């Protein structure tokens, strides 16, 4: 038989469609184990912050008879999903997208009946509230402003909040209008020339929960209008921001800047990468120069999602135990949900695999553990002018490492 | 048959179906009759809520009404603006706690469908104004845990114009562990610090968590005489607010949403059975209110002779094209207007039903109204 699974990308889907079918490649000419057995995929592409769209693919995918469930899209269509997945008892791999660059907050789920939770988030929990606990808190910030853009989800914050009232620190929590040329003009129109100047006081200390693109504009728009000054110290909390981005708003900062995102462990897995004295074909072994940096995370965890996908095919046919799938279209009142189902969800709970980005497994709570952070700050030289030094990391199992 | 509508409830779905039948009733008492189908859904089911709203747009409808959560507004938002079916959705009470407008998905130009029977939370406005007149500087707003912070957005932009500050602290379901806790990770220097942060506080909890909140805060001796603390939400009875302050040690505020009082014509609006109203959430007041809405769109829309008939919609196909009517009937029921339980209802441009009005109850010195607030003129009293 074959081993069929559905996915469905929000627009602009290219790389998704690209990384997911090199995941489904790579797998069929290297896995041993999936050798003689067939994988074919279908793959669906929606239009962004449409969850009807969503639940129209995902039903034509239930009835080609699908194992499983990849997906990679907003909060919206994710909830829309999940509903449906539960219903149909079909297992969901979800990888939360991006949302536009800003700063990601974990969906707002619905809750599932008592283990009939077949929706497994790959992307880990979002864990920059202790980081941003700890940075605070070394730098004995008492006042501090946290700027947001129109996207961010401030629920993402609550466990951040309520430490920082335990701590009694005070926090002001300041919305950053789509338009940066209307926010500042705003400032100095709304506000008397001493009012302004103690804001400007305040502004010292700020948190960014910004797009790398939005920091960049807050920064020069702050430097242009004489609200920022030498004399300040600006945290950027993303997951997401590359290393041109950082160059970016260190040239544009007139003071301190400190950057929190997630970085993966180096992938040599030497001999596992290694077949008869030669080295193996596929993204995670042998991947092309400056291929992996083109890629958002988003896309690292869609392939190690196949990955763990595989991992559980391996174990339920080694164990000889097998489900055929069968065809239900989910829209029509009358579907029944997929018996298979609770079983192939198990199996793909109780997998451990190392991909791109390390380690994925899942815990009882259905979440991915493990996250790395790097916390970098400022530096300058006349040669090379400004650039951004690693002070710290911070991980999940350890803790931060290194000072501040 | 010619006037067919479609209706979505979550469970529960009593209160709702019953008054959305008495509209439907009051109604048909003043030659072409509305028909309409109900559907049942679970609470937090949008895939449920997209199944039954499919299979009413085969059996073709003129209008959705619905009342969900937003899990399931969403999801029918999306289906209502593919297909081009007028939706008139009305927001249910949150288990209680203070109500946040749904996040919904962004609508192709001109093709919004989905309009929103509640007006705008302008709670916001209200603590605004309530906190600056008390000259509050430093307070903590308490909300619960199914209360979405989101809306606090521009109460907390505002708040940071004043140079107030503001402590926001999430109280979770679990009452007798939110305190207990506080004992075990605190010194008494800091728990003592803690007590007195507790004297300026606005609660954004459910009528009865707040009263579960109030004792237990008196109980562990974290409550005082000289503290002020302010209930904010659109929904709490009289013998609830009462349970607040007799409960509470210091003075007490209450900020929620009222209403105007309407041969006698038999009807829930004008000839009220006794006691029936009081039995009734605010939902079900804007649910009845959202019929004679439509209602008065299909009396429009026929005098006019603009009529379209309903179209078998199939959500499976793809190719299946939107309601040819959807757009007419839709720009119909947004330049309507009518009086009924919640008062005047109506929709501005931006697809909203702008009037909302709050009382504010204060504090023998037991709890009398001091002031209202609508959204017209604003502040109405000191
Ligand atoms: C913001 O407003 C300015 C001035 O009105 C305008 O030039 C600009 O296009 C607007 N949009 C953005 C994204 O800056
Ligand atoms: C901590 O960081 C150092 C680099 O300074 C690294 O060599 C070491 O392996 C790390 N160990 C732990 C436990 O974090
Ligand atoms: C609430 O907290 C107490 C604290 O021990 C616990 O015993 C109880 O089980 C909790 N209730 C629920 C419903 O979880
Ligand atoms: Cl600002
Ligand atoms: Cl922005
Ligand atoms: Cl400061
Ligand atoms: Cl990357
Ligand atoms: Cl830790
Ligand atoms: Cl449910
Ligand atoms: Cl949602
Ligand atoms: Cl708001
Ligand atoms: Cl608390």
């Not at 997208?97 to 992307?123: Q, V």
């Not at 590359?242 to 180096?266: C, K, N, W, Y």
């Not at 949900?337 to 793909?348: F, Q």
């Amino acid at each position: 038989s074959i081993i069929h699974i559905g996915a469905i990308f929000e627009e602009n889907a290219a790389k998704d469609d690209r990384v997911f079918q090199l995941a489904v490649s790579d797998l069929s000419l290297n896995d041993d184990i999936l050798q003689s057995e067939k994988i074919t995929y279908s793959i669906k592409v929606i239009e962004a912050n449409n969850p009807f769209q969503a639940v129209q693919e995902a039903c034509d995918l239930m009835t080609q008879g699908i194992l499983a469930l990849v997906t990679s899209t907003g909060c919206a269509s994710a909830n829309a999903l999940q509903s449906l997945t539960d219903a149909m008892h079909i297992p969901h791999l979800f990888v939360q997208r991006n949302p536009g660059g800003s700063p990601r907050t974990a969906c707002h789920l619905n809750p599932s009946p008592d283990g009939e939770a077949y929706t497994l988030a790959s992307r880990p929990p979002v864990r920059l509230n202790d980081v941003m606990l700890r940075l605070v808190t070394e730098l004995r910030w008492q006042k501090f402003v946290m700027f947001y853009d129109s996207e961010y989800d401030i629920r993402g914050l609550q466990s951040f909040l309520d430490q920082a009232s335990r701590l009694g620190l005070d926090v002001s929590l300041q919305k950053v209008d789509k338009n940066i040329s209307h926010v500042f003009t705003s400032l100095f129109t709304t506000m008397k020339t001493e009012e302004l100047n103690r804001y400007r006081d305040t502004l010292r200390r700020a948190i960014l929960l910004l797009s790398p693109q939005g920091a960049h504009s807050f920064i020069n728009e702050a430097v242009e209008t004489n609200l920022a000054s030498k004399d300040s110290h600006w945290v950027f909390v993303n997951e997401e921001i590359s290393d041109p981005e950082i160059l970016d708003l260190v040239h544009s900062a007139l003071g301190r800047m400190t950057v929190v995102r997630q970085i993966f462990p180096s992938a040599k897995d030497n001999q596992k990468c290694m077949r008869n004295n030669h080295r193996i074909s596929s993204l995670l072994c042998d991947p092309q120069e400056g291929y992996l940096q083109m890629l958002q995370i988003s896309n690292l965890y869609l392939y190690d999602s196949v990955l763990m996908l595989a991992n559980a095919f391996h174990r339920k046919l080694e164990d000889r135990k097998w489900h055929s799938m069968a065809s239900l279209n989910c829209i029509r009142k009358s579907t029944k949900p997929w018996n298979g189902g609770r079983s192939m969800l198990d199996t793909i709970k109780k997998g451990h695999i190392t991909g791109l980005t390390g380690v994925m497994e899942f815990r009882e709570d259905s979440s991915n553990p493990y996250v790395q952070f790097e916390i970098l700050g400022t530096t300058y030289s006349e040669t090379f002018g400004k650039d951004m030094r690693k002070l710290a990391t911070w991980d999940s199992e350890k803790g931060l490492n290194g000072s501040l």
